[PDB]
mmCIF file of N, CA, C and O in Angstrom:
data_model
loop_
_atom_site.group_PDB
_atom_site.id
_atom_site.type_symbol
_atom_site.label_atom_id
_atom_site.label_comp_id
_atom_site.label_asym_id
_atom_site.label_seq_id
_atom_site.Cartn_x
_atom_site.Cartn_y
_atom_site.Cartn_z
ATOM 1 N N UNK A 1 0.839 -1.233 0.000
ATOM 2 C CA UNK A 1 0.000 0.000 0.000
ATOM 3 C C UNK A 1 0.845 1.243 0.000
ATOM 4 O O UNK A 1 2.010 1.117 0.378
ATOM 5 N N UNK A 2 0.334 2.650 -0.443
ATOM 6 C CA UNK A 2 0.837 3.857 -0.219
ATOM 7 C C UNK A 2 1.774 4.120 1.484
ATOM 8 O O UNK A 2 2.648 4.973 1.638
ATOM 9 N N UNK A 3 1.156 2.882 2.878
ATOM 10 C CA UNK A 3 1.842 3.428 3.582
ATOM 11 C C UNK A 3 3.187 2.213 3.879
ATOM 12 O O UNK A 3 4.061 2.152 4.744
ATOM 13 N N UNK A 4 2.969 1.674 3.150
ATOM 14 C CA UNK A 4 4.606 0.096 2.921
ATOM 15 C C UNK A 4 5.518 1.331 2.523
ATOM 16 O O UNK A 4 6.485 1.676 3.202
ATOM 17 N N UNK A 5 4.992 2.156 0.994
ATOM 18 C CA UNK A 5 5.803 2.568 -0.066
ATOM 19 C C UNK A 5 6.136 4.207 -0.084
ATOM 20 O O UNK A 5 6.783 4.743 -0.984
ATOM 21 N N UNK A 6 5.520 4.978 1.190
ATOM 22 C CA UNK A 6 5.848 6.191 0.930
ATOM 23 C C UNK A 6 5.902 6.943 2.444
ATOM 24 O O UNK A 6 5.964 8.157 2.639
ATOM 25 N N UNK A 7 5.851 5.613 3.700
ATOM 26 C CA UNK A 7 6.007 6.005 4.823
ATOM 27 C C UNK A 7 6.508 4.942 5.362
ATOM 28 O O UNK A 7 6.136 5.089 6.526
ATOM 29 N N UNK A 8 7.137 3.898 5.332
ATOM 30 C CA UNK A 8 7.692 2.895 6.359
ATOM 31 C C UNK A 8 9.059 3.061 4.886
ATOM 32 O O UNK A 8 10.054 2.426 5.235
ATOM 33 N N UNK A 9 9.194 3.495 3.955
ATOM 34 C CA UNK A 9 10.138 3.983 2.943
ATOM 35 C C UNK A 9 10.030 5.033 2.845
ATOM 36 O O UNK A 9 9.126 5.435 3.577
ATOM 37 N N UNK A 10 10.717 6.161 2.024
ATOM 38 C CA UNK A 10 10.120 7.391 1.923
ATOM 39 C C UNK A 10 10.078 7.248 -0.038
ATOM 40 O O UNK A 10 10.707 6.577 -0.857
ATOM 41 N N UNK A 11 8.844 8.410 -0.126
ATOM 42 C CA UNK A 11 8.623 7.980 -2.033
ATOM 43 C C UNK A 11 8.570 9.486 -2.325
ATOM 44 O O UNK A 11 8.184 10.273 -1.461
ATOM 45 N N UNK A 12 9.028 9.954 -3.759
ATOM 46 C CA UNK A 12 8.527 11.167 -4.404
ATOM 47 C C UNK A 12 7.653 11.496 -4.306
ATOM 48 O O UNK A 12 6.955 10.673 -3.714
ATOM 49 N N UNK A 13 6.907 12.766 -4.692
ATOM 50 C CA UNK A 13 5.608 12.901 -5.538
ATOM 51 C C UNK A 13 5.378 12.214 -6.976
ATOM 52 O O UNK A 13 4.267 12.058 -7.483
ATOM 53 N N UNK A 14 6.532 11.848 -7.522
ATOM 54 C CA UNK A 14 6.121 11.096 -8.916
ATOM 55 C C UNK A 14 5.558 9.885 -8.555
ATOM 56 O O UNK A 14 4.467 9.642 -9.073
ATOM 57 N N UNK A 15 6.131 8.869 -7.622
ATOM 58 C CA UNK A 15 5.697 7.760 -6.980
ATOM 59 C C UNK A 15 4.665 7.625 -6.453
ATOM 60 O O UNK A 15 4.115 6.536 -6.616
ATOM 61 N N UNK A 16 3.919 8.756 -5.535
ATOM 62 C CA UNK A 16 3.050 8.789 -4.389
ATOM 63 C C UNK A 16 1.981 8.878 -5.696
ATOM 64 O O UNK A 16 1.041 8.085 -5.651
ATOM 65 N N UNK A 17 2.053 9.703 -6.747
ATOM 66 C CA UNK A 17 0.940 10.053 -7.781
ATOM 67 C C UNK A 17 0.487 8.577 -8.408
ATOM 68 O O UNK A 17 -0.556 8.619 -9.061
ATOM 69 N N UNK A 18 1.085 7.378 -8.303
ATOM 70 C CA UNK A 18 0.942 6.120 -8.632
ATOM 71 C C UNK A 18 -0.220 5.652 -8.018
ATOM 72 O O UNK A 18 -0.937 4.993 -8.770
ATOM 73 N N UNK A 19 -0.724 5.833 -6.573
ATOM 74 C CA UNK A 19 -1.680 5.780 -5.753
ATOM 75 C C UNK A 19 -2.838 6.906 -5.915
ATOM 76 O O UNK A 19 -3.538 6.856 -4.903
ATOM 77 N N UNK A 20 -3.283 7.865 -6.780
ATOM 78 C CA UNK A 20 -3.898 8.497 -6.587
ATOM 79 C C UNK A 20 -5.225 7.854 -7.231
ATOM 80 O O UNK A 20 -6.298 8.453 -7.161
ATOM 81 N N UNK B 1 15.017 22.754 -7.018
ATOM 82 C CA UNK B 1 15.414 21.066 -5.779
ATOM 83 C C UNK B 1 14.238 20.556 -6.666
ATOM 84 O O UNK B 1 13.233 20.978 -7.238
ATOM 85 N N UNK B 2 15.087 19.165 -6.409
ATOM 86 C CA UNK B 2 14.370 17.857 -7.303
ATOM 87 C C UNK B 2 13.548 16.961 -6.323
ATOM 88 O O UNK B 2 13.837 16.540 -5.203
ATOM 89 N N UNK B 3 12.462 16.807 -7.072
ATOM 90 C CA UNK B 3 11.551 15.993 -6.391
ATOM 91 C C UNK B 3 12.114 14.530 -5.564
ATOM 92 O O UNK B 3 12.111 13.358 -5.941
ATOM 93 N N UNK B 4 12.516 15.074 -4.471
ATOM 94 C CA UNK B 4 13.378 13.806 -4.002
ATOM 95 C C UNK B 4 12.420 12.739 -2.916
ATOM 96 O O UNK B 4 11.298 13.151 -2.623
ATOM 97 N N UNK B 5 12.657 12.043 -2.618
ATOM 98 C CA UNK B 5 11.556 10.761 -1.537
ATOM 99 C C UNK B 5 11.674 11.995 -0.136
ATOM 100 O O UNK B 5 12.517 12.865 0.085
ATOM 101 N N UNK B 6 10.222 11.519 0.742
ATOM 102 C CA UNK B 6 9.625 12.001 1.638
ATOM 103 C C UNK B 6 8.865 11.149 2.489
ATOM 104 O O UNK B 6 7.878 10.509 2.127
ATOM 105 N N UNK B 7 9.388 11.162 3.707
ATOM 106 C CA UNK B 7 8.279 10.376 4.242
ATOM 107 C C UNK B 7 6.669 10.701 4.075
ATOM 108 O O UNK B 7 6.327 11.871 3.903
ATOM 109 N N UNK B 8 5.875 9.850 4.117
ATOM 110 C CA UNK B 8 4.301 10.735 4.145
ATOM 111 C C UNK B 8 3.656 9.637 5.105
ATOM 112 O O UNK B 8 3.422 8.505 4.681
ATOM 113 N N UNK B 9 3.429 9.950 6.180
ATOM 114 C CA UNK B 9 2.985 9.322 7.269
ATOM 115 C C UNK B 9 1.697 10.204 7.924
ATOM 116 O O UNK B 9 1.581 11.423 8.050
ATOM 117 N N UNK B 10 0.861 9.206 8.258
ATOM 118 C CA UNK B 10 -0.574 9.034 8.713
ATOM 119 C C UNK B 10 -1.624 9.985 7.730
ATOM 120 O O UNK B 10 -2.228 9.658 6.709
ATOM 121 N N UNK B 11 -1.590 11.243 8.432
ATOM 122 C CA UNK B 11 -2.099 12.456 8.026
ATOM 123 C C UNK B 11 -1.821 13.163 6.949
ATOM 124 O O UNK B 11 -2.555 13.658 6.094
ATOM 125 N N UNK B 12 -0.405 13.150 7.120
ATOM 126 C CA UNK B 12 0.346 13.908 5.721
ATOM 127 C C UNK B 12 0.220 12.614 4.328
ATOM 128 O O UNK B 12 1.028 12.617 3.399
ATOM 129 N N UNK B 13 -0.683 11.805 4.411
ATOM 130 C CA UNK B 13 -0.597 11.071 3.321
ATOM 131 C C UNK B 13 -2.130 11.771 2.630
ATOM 132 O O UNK B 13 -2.458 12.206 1.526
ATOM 133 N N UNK B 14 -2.859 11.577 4.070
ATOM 134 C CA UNK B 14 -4.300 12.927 3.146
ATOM 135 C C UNK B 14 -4.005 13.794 2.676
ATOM 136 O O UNK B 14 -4.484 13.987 1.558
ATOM 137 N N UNK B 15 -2.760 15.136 3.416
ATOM 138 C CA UNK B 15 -2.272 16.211 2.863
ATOM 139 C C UNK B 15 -1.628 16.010 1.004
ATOM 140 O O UNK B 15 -1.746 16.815 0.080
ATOM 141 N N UNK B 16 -0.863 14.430 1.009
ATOM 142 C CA UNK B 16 -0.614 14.526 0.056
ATOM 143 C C UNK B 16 -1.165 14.420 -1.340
ATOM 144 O O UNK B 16 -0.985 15.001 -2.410
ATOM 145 N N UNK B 17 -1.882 13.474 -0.903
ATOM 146 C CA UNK B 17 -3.506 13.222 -1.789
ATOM 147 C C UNK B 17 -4.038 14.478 -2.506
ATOM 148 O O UNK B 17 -4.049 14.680 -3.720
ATOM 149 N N UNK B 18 -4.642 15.584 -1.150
ATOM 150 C CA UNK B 18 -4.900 16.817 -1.531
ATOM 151 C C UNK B 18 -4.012 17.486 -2.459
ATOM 152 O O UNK B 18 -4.529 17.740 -3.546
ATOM 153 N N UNK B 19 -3.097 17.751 -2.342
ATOM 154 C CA UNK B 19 -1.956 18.342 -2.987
ATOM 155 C C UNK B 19 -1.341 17.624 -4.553
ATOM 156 O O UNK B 19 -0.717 18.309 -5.364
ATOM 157 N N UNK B 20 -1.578 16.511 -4.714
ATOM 158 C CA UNK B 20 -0.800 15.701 -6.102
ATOM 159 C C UNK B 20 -1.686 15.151 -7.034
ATOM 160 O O UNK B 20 -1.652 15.231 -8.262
ATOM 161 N N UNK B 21 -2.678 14.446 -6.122
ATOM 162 C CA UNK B 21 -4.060 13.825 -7.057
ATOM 163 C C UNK B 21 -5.512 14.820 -7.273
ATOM 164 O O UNK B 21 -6.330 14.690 -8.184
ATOM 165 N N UNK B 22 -5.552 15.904 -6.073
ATOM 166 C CA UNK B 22 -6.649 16.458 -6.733
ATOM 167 C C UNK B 22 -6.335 17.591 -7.262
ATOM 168 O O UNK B 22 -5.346 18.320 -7.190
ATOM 169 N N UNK B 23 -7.328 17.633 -7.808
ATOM 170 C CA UNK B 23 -7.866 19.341 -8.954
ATOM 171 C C UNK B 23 -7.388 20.425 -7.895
ATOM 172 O O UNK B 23 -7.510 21.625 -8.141
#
C-alpha cells in the first residue's frame, strides 16, 4: 500500500501520484 | 530542488492526496 511505499520507505511525488 | 523521496505518514498522506491527485 501507499503506507509500505511512501512512509515505512520514503517515495517522491512522482511515486506517491501512482496511488492516486 | 528535485523531487526527491519524503516520508508521508498518517495524516500527511491525506495532505498529500490533496496536494498531487486532486484538482
Amino acid at each position: 500500500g501507499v503506507v509500505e511505499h511512501c512512509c515505512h520507505r520514503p517515495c517522491s511525488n512522482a511515486e506517491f501520484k501512482k496511488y492516486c | 530542488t528535485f523531487d526527491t523521496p519524503k516520508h508521508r505518514c498518517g495524516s500527511e498522506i491525506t495532505n498529500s492526496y490533496m496536494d498531487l491527485c486532486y484538482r
